[PDB]
Amino acid sequence: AAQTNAPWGLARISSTSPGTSTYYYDESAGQGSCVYVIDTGIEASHPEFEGRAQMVKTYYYSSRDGNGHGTHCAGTVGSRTYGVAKKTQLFGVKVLDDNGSGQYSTIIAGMDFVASDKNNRNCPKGVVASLSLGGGYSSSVNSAAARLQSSGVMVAVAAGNNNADARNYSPASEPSVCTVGASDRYDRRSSFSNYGSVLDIFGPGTSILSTWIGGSTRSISGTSMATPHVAGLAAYLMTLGKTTAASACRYIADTANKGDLSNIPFGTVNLLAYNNYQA
Ligand SMILES: [Ca+2]
Ligand SMILES: [Ca+2]
């Protein structure tokens, strides 16, 4: 399948070189897989989700996404026009309030919830959890991310937007999950992207067009935008049967475009998420 005039990020993950505008992908498009977007919620009624999204848990008064961040991330994971895995099932877990913030205790609760909830969902091809959030280092938060990963869920987390070593942030610093850095359309590490030995892979994160609340669209930047690209790619590869939740991160790194990125500090991997699609 091919989406012409696609958002640059989608085009980039299906190309060995920057500058293309077509997103090449397999028609399976992640169907059969499930991706939990642990964020500010998802505007499930957005036409772009085609009824494939639904709120499953909220830690606040409402399950509505009154911020937009979660809806944007969910959109990059699997909205029709802006998503990587256009046929995946999206589950929203609102651990962040409408201002985009949340305490570690509920973020941890949200992760433990997904580890359990997946047991009563029909996700034949696998379960992915996309966490475009984080804060200062916390062994408890890292432990929660490790538990979720250990439970059989492919956990993708944002590296952080502090242009610093991700070792000081959580859950970014948990070695067992998939920590995602951001790049821009010219293959440069995004100026705000964290780096370091703990990063596993890079994904498009600058000027990413996706869904927004109120049935709209918006372009924003952040490792928060790069994360859903790899979470969606994982769901996509899993329904394709190329990898499993336990080894998806390693598989993505093994098959990534290598050495394409500029301004990558020594010690940080120079790997860019790539779907290796060939028609
Ligand atoms: Ca290249
Ligand atoms: Ca890792």
Curated annotation (Swiss-Prot):
Single Gene Ontology BP annotation: proteolysis
Keywords, ordered alphabetically: Calcium, Disulfide bond, Hydrolase, Metal-binding, Protease, Serine protease, Signal, Zymogen
Catalytic reaction list: Hydrolysis of keratin, and of other proteins with subtilisin-like specificity. Hydrolyzes peptide amides
Residues involved in Ca(2+) 1 binding: P175, V177, D200
Positions that bind Ca(2+) 2: T16, D260
SS bonds (residue pairs): C34-C123, C178-C249
UniProt-annotated catalytic positions: D39, H69, S224
Chain's role: Hydrolyzes keratin at aromatic and hydrophobic residues.
Protein family: Belongs to the peptidase S8 family.
Protein name as it appears in the record: Proteinase K
Species: Parengyodontium album
Full protein segment contained here: 106 to 384 of 384
